[model samples]
Target chain A: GKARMRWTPELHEAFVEAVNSLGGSERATPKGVLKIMKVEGLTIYHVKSHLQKYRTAR
Target chain B: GKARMRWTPELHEAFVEAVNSLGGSERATPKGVLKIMKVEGLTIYHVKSHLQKYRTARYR
Candidate 1:
């Protein structure tokens, strides 16, 4: 996910369009839509190391 | 699920970072946030097929 610059209709359209182009599925949330966006390519996102372990142990 | 990608953040930071990093989420109407990016040796991209359902049903 890129840094949120601002909220705009055009920007929203671009986002939805891009996500749709990803060719994956998503469920809509009241706050917004939720899709599994890849973490590849250049970005500043972070994922924990122990999440899977935590999940499995739980 | 393995095909999902382009949005992974490290820890809550990675999650947020990826969501925050999402060109799409950034442009989202309400804009979603990662809140959690887990999975070592990953560039914050898609979840492995087996892991996808697990993540959603368990982690999520």
Candidate 2:
């Protein structure tokens, strides 16, 4: 019974902001993104996963 | 550059069909499902990965 954060467009926008803030997707690590995000229950893995999927999709 | 099969409803439905054919999700193995699926370029890990995500979502 695993619970995951259901992603929204705004949440993805926030992720984009984080990535851009850290000088683009290639250089932005998950830990760094998580630090910038500062969202509750948003694990490093979640950020890391988003980075893999979204960054590659770009 | 990893190329994964972008999952769709029909694909998932086929997977469900495979699982049911093998006597439900719990009994269905990835290798078995792969053989049953018969889709080109579809790997075992894809089936395995789908099982972990979709199965648990409903198993609860």
Candidate 3:
């Protein structure tokens, strides 16, 4: 099993786009982001975790 | 399942370091890198895929 997963700038860009497309971070959901971003090998947990940080950063 | 996982610069750096620590990309393995990285929500598949790319890039 992989110990670490790298978070590329491209993925972050996609994540931002996903959140923005959903009407902003406040309105984004893990499932929604996943559906929009269409990232490979990702899980809702990862989205939710990142969203948590995104929201906190805002 | 998650649509995709993000690859942060830090993680990439860490990957490079891990590979080097393992005595270069040729000596690195997904399982070994995983153990060294200790990142959450990551799997062998992720490491393997990334390592494949890493090795490919090295040859180019």
Which candidate number maximizes lDDT? 3
Cα deviation in Å at residue B38, candidate 2? Answer: 0.5
Q: Of the candidates shown, which would achieve the greatest DockQ relative to the real structure?
A: 3
Scored against the true structure, residue A41 in model 3 reaches a CA lDDT of: 95
Residue by residue across A1-58, what tens digits does model 3's lDDT show? 5343466888987787676555456556889889988878988888888889877776
Q: Give DockQ for candidates 1 onward, in order.
A: 0.03, 0.02, 0.05
Question: What fraction of the native alpha-carbon contacts across the interface, defined at 8 angstroms, is recovered by model 3?
Answer: 0.00
Q: Model 1 over residues B1-60: C-alpha lDDT tens digits?
A: 243344422232334334445443424222133223333223423333323433344332
Indicate the worst ten consecutive residues by lDDT in candidate 3 chain A. A19-28
Q: Candidate 1: which docking quality band?
A: incorrect
Interface RMSD for candidate 2 relative to the native interface: 15.4
True-vs-predicted CA distance for residue B22, candidate 1, Å:
32
Candidate 2 per-residue lDDT, tens place, B1-60, comes to: 443465555456667888889888778899998887655456798789988786677552
| A1-58: candidate 1 lDDT, tens digit per residue | 4353343465434444333343211311212222332323312221121222223542
In order, candidate lDDTs are 0.32, 0.73, 0.74
Model 3 TM-score is 0.48
Better of 1 and 3 by DockQ: 3
Instruction: Output the number of the TM-score-best candidate.
Output: 3
